Symmetry: C5
Subunit: 311 residues, 5 copies
């Protein structure tokens, strides 16, 4: 079977729609997500036209192999989608209504700059290649675009699922390609990060700051170095669920800042001890008393600067 | 083959049944489980009717390709089920009895609020999309719903496998859809959590509390900070088997509370030392003696409040 | 093709045999193992009977599609087996001899009560569902049951591969189902657990007991708390390769007992220090001297009691 | 269908092209990457030639089964590629234009000598085996070689995708083989390694160096040994994402050098203490004062030597 | 299609050959490897004889389904190989030349006794089962056995790929089976183990030995116990990439020996302290001075004995 012939020289319009049934496995490190959806396609094939009077039927059902069907592919998929044809219906005028249910692993890049208080626009790119006989063009049937209310993406809030109605028309391997952009806007559920990562990091940092109320170097060394090891465990835990980015992320900047604060607290502990041994405890006492205010104040200010730069 | 024609304008009833053979791989983090079951379907096709006296046969066996079979799908599956047709039997009145054995990975959300003392209702949603010729509606044959006695879901107790007999009939993309809810009620075997997680956390907490019977700051710092590191290892171990939730879980609340208790014990250890250095051991002794009772009492009370709020 | 018709009303006997070629991937946590084997089936089909004089052949080879073959499935499999028909042969009396080679992931529950000194009976359940026309029942051809000498299951000793000759016949959805139990008896190679887990745990426990020959609280705290952290690493390492059981395992009981011993050694270290500070070293010396004998003696006795209860 | 017959004894030229749509999952440890691309093939089949005026059509479309197609394979793939034929077009002279879209996991070795400041040349080898009737030879159509602007390989910069135009024609099992080398030049985005690995390693090293301003052996031991444990954590974290190489890598050399520096700092700490105990603090003070300059200077010089040897 | 009939009563010889294209993923823990190779088969089928004058061609090409092909399987594979037929060429006498390219995961046991300085002989077992009509026997065509020069197995050196030319013809389930052994001799690239595992273990052991130059029990306890924890991390790292063996491995023996050395160093540290407290520093000094020589000497001797016993 060849494509439908044109009445004049107009392109063949394939109306499309994606109805999301499931959205799962958003892998941040892999920058992929899995989707289970309906793909609806509609186009006119005059060769399939019939008179409902002489036929006795108002609609005709067909098998995919019996008629011409446009080769629609997804651009940003790992492997070709797994699809199952649900229905193919032809109306008297020859308007074909195709419906399939598919599952696919989608490759969509993520911006981790504001992580874990980030939002993303996931893309699903639909494409059709033109044939020598005629130019095939994609369109969006907005009445056939949507998502199930039960669609839950673990650790994310689904804001909207819309399509950019105008296709991207360009040449690829000496043939025209029509590309539609389906956009799934999501925002991260940051809740869990506060009691599980943010607050534990602060607690161990505040424990390291008790060294500013102690003159015992041996105890101070234990306090700062042991809390540093606990911080390193949290840093490793955090960075393992993120890919390596060529830019600084919000969490990355915080982690880096905390390393500086631990390093400076070691300098203070070292300086205070050196002075006490040099029989200068009065000078050490002045530094330690200043540190009690300076460290929390500089920590709060540095965080305000960071939050400002990132948000 | 087209669907059976109606005698009057009634919808076509497809009687369904699921008999669980196996239940395995309940992934908490992924909120998925694997199922191996029988799917039984039954409907009337008058075109397949015969005389049992003339035909000499009481039943006729058919191949799937030879007759019309409703397209039944699962809503909450990763990929389409892997099915093998076991039998297709037609009775003289034309009643078709279809049986297949399938395996599928089911997506079902879990409520971790009461974890690890939680119970879940896992769902298996059966669906049929109506055709242009006629409306297809689902029903439950309770005599064909059940589970194998040997069905074991590692770390869970299987309470019941029932079906909500009334289908959810709704319009989806200008066609009727008939959905059935099969519910598998399970409860977590919390046993192991007590000797492996709960009791070890308490032991290391009680070890940190020996600092209330010591005046040695250096030893106290070692006790509280080393036990905190051991607690962090347990917290990481626990939270790795749970997904990130937009709500507080029972275990999460306990873990958070323990962080506060460790932080307050550091404050006590710090305060006691500051007083001893300031030549005020009498005041420190009063605080340390109070801490010996206050810490276990406040720990027990806070746990009673938490258990009350969650259960 | 329909099943062979009965001479009288007798059920159709399908003789079976499983010859193990490979046994691999015994996953304890998943309670699954992978098998690669031959499945032999044999039954009489009188419609296939012939005269070897007239036909000039003593055996007839057939393609699966050409003749009736019983639908044999495995009960306890993740997904349906991956099978390849090797041969189908018919003798003059109509005795069919079928042979296939298959691979399958088998779900078989394990008893971890005596771990790592445990033995298991892995099961492979063959099943057949009776048809409308006649009742099918399974049997064991013992001459066709066996295993290759090279069959190695990493970390296990293979004791025997036998079949329970009488099937477990029963009704499932108003049809006879004939079930055969193939049992693979295995025992764990416990060797490695001794130098890798058992002896390291004892060494670090004995190191913690050197605190009974020291009066230095700061050193004692370091000894007991550092060895506890090392023990926690071994406990995590051990429990990660085991599933969560609703019963106590031998290793679990040992791990729990060691936690008590560490907790009691902290109590001793704390008590000894409190007395020395209270200017009572004579009383502390009596306790520490008693501990030197009491701890190893109670440890040995508690282990004898545990080994007795579990073995 | 047999291959096209030669006009004279010339080999059959199959013009090739690869257009990269997606590049993902560059696994360093596995030395593999996943590719989703277009494979274009073009060759002359005179049997397929036609008159454009007589046939009325300027281009004829064919199904793969209808015509002869060369068996093209990839040399360095895990499994055979997953391909979907997009188009097959024949021009009047019999020039066939084939296009498929494929996905494949490519095995390509990596040079980790300069890691994480390394660049790689990933290879995709195209191969054809000659037939008994005629010799098949490969060629590159440069107009059909390229990549999508959006092609992003996480943690890498894509420099170029070119093909070595001269094929490697060699005998293999008494038949000609024609191999083409497609080269994807990439360079690692080293950014993240600086704040996440390099700077943390330096901070903990500088903390260990505060022992050169302390006379307290107990504190010094804690400083050097605790920071060594933190370094071991980073070394394990680093080496887990790299395969075991039969050569030294840049990161490996740095890690080894840091071990020496920690070992030498322990020697210093030990020597200083031995002298103080031997009532020689003047000699110890000379060594510790020298160490304050010697350690950072030798560290900087050793790093300059290493960077010179590796770059 | 049935097998070729014999001219006399001779068995049918199937000449074989394996040409390795790729060797990857040698999993030590799983005792598997992945292979991508050519499988060449050759046998005579007189029924396929043709006159090249009448057929117009000197060599016939066939589709697998069109002619009789021996059922060749691999014994030691996880699942049946993934194969793609490259060519089937029949010459006028009826000599068939079959070629396929396959990928398979091979199960081959490994001897870890000399790990990481071990060598292995990986096996690929080819098998054919005889039919009812005639006995099938395998042979090796040495001109069709080999490997690609580029064949790289990460972390291994490939020594040779040869075949044991004499098949193992044996009875299995009342039929002849003909088995060929293809042996891939490999040796481990031990390089990386020296700077990454061996030397770090020695450095931390030497750090623990600085306790023999210290009289400070609290510092000594910190030194020996902290380095023991670092050693435990290396032991876990090492043992995780090895399966549980029912024998002692070279690395296992070293790891066990190091535990003894750490345990004995704790005994020394404990004894030395007990004597100093008992006002006997002269006796302690004699033990500590002896330990400075005894520990490195006994360590070197024990390693010579171990290397001798294993190599
Ligand atoms: C007054 C002392 C100021 C110290 C400032 C330290 C700057 C460190 C720069 C790091 C650059 C990144 C190399 C780091 C060694 C640790 C420094 C020890 C300080 C000792 C203080 C002695 C008190 C007299
Ligand atoms: C130490 C680390 C402290 C982290 C502070 C949170 C960062 C933050 O304040 O994040 C802010 C984001 C919201 O960002 P947005 O409004 O969508 O940005 C767009 C803004 N424009 C349009 C003006 C550019 O989330 C919150 O309000 C959650 C606050 C969590 C508080 C954590 C308490 C501990
Ligand atoms: C004579 C003292 C006996 C101590 C017995 C301790 C019982 C602990 C029960 C745990 C139950 C699970 C809560 C645990 C706090 C640590 C106890 C510190 C003991 C201090 C001893 C002081 C010596 C006068
Ligand atoms: C009487 C002392 C009360 C201390 C209360 C501490 C409040 C901490 C608030 C945390 C906010 C969330 C920033 C935390 C630094 C550690 C505090 C050190 C206390 C020193 C006590 C000195 C004794 C005279
Ligand atoms: C420190 C951490 C302390 C944790 C204490 C256990 C929580 C608890 O008491 O949990 C309570 C749950 C039972 O709740 P349920 O019957 O399933 O809820 C439904 C009830 N309604 C419908 C009335 C709301 O489990 C248990 O029986 C706990 C037994 C284990 C005690 C472990 C002690 C150590
Ligand atoms: C501290 C932890 C100590 C662990 C001690 C091993 C437990 C045990 O003694 O286990 C016992 C099992 C054997 O049991 P079985 O014969 O198979 O039981 C069936 C018995 N019936 C038929 C009578 C019921 O292993 C052994 O042969 C012990 C070898 C391990 C030595 C440990 C060296 C350290
Ligand atoms: C002279 C003392 C020799 C010590 C030998 C120790 C042998 C240990 C045997 C382990 C068997 C495996 C149980 C181990 C407890 C630690 C021993 C503490 C030694 C204290 C020495 C006091 C000096 C008078
Ligand atoms: C402690 C570890 C310190 C590591 C220092 C980086 C090594 C380096 O200086 O690496 C050098 C590479 C660049 O190499 P290239 O020019 O692309 O090589 C090709 C050269 N040929 C073709 C001429 C041979 O990285 C840089 O641009 C340095 C940026 C990293 C700075 C890290 C700061 C800390
Ligand atoms: C002046 C002392 C120089 C020390 C040199 C140490 C060389 C170590 C060689 C390691 C080879 C790899 C075996 C290592 C034991 C630690 C050495 C303790 C040194 C004690 C110094 C006492 C001061 C008088
Ligand atoms: C502490 C750990 C000490 C490890 C010592 C290396 C073991 C060894 O010397 O291993 C020996 C193997 C070679 O063995 P082979 O010749 O292949 O065996 C066949 C022998 N027959 C046939 C006679 C039985 O490798 C080497 O040359 C090791 C060199 C690396 C030394 C690392 C130093 C640090
Ligand atoms: Cl697709
Ligand atoms: Cl489904
Ligand atoms: Cl099966
Ligand atoms: Cl029954
Ligand atoms: Cl029955
Ligand atoms: Cl390929
Ligand atoms: Cl195979
Ligand atoms: Na079509
Ligand atoms: Na059908
Ligand atoms: Na059949
Ligand atoms: Na310490
Ligand atoms: Na073809
Ligand atoms: Na064949």
């Amino acid at each position: 079977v060849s494509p439908p012939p044109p009445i004049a020289d107009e392109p063949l319009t394939v109306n499309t729609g994606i109805y999301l049934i499931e959205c799962y496995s958003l892998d941040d490190k892999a920058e992929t997500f899995k989707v289970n959806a309906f793909l609806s396609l509609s186009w006119k094939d005059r060769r399939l036209a019939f008179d409902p009077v002489r036929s006795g039927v108002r609609v005709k059902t067909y098998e995919p192999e019996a008629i011409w069907i446009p080769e629609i592919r997804f651009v940003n998929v790992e492997n070709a989608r797994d699809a199952d044809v649900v229905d193919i219906s032809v109306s008297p005028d020859g308007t074909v209504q195709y419906l399939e249910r598919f599952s696919a692993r989608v490759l969509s890049p993520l911006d981790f700059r504001r992580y874990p208080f980030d939002s993303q626009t996931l893309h699903i790119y639909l494409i059709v290649r033109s044939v020598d006989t005629r130019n095939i063009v994609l369109a969006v049937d907005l009445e056939k675009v949507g998502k199930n209310d039960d669609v839950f993406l673990t650790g994310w809030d689904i804001e909207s699922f819309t399509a950019v109605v105008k296709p991207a028309n360009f040449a690829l391997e000496d043939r025209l390609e029509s590309k539609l952009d389906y956009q799934l806007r999501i925002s991260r559920q940051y809740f869990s990060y506060i009691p599980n990562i943010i607050l534990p990091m602060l607690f161990i940092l505040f424990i390291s700051w008790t060294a500013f109320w102690s003159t015992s170097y041996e105890a101070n060394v234990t306090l700062v170095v042991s809390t540093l090891i606990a911080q390193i465990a949290f840093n490793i835990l955090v960075e393992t669920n993120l890919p390596k980015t060529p830019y600084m992320t919000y969490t990355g900047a915080i982690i880096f800042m905390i390393y500086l604060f631990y390093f400076v607290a070691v300098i203070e502990v070292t300086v205070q001890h050196y002075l006490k041994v040099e029989s200068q405890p009065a000078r050490a006492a002045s530094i330690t008393r200043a540190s009690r205010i300076a460290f929390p104040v500089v920590f709060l200010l540095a965080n305000i600067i960071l939050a400002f730069l990132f948000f």
